[PDB]
Amino acid sequence: RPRLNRLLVLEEAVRVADGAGGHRLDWQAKGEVWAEVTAGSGSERAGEFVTLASVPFTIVVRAAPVGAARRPRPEQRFREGARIFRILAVAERDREGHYLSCFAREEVVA
Template sequence: MSGVTLNRRLMLEDATRVSDGAGGYVEAWQPLGELWAGLKAGSGRERIGGTATLSAVPYRITVRAAPFGAASRPRPDQRFREGTRIFRILAVADDDADRRFLTCHCIEEVTG
């Protein structure tokens, strides 16, 4: 893939279970490291759920490839963070035949 611009620094995070002190657990997000990325937004949509409106925008996020099993390789059960913005990773695929880049299909959900 030519012309890839990785101009956004995103934090890759992984969910962990933390004891809540009452025999259960809560989900916490642990930073794994920063990755330079390129973001491309898709068409957004809006849903009304209960008392809140949820806006969902799909993104294609491109990052440098990493070997399978490496902590720096994104997985579908992880997310990217940019400040207060959260991009939930839905799927990850090789972006080019040389396997230099990965495309992460993500969704950014915003309540309003």
């Protein structure tokens, strides 16, 4: 069972809609979770005009019902200091349902 050791400031953006239909994100902070962060095989990835450096980072937190504040939705991102971990998906790692796998990137521009 996972050994949780990092403090990840979970962050959810409020979506202020603009006139054209596109929302504007704020990334106001949410309450902090505890998690383990297990790396994957990382390599740099061609962005737009940026040679973005990415690593897979399966993050494991504890669980909650889907209508609770403690669930990381894939809308949200983690942030440890200045290292933003995006959330690709959340997937309910444990069999009994105690732990959630998340999926991250840590795309540093490099």
